[PDB]
């Protein structure tokens, strides 16, 4: 993996 | 609107000690681990990737091997607490706590490490 953006920071899997 | 908070955004810890850094999320009645994501990172380093009620250890930066743990008895009170044992000077910096449970939020915590004497 998914990929998430929160207030212009992103987060992915391994 | 799903909100993560942090009761302390700055920890000052001694070199070689243990520290627990907290971030809070809302919980009600049931907490389906199947839907819960807890992510800890600092800079470019994955510390915790907790998905389906399981820490995934392949992804965990080497500096945190055997030192970093999510306190999971805490998830039910809406506490996603990162424990780090044997704090190193390189542990100083900006941590981010991301939590998803229907949509998501992240907060920043700063750690400062006092070098010995």
Author numbering:
A (entry chain B): 0 to 13
B (entry chain A): 18 to 134
Paper text:
The clinical success of PD-1/PD-L1 immune checkpoint targeting antibodies in cancer is followed by efforts to develop small molecule inhibitors with better penetration into solid tumors and more favorable pharmacokinetics. Here we report the crystal structure of a macrocyclic peptide inhibitor (peptide 104) in complex with PD-L1. Peptide 104 was selected for the experiments because it is a close structural analog of p101, and both macrocycles are characterized by comparable affinity. Macrocyclic peptide 104 effectively blocks PD-1/PD-L1 interaction at the cell surface.
The structure was solved by molecular replacement at 1.9 Å resolution. The macrocyclic inhibitor folds into a β-hairpin additionally stitched at the free ends by the cyclizing bond. The macrocycle binds almost perpendicular to the strands constituting the C, C’, G, and F β-sheet of the PD-L1 IgV domain, docking at its slightly concave hydrophobic surface. The macrocycle exposes a large hydrophobic patch composed of π-stacked sidechains of 104Phe1 and 104Phe3, 104Ile5, the proximal atoms of 104Arg8 and 104Phe10, which complements the relatively flat hydrophobic patch at the surface of PD-L1. The sulfur/π interaction between 104Phe3 and Met115 strengthens the binding. The sidechains of 104Ile5 and 104Phe10 dock at an adjacent shallow groove composed of sidechains Met115, Ala121, proximal atoms of Arg113, and the sidechain of Tyr123 with the most significant interactions involving alkyl-π interaction of Met115 and 104Phe10 and T-stacking of the latter residue and Tyr123 sidechain. 104Arg6 contributes two direct hydrogen bonds with the carboxyl of Asp122 and the carbonyl oxygen of Tyr123. The overlay of the structures of PD-L1 in complexes with p104 determined in this study and with PD-1 determined previously reveals that the binding sites at the surface of PD-L1 largely overlap. The structure of p104 in complex with PD-L1 determined in this study shows no indication of macrocycle bifurcation, demonstrating that such a phenomenon is characteristic either for p101 only or for the particular crystal lattice characterizing the previously reported p101 structure.
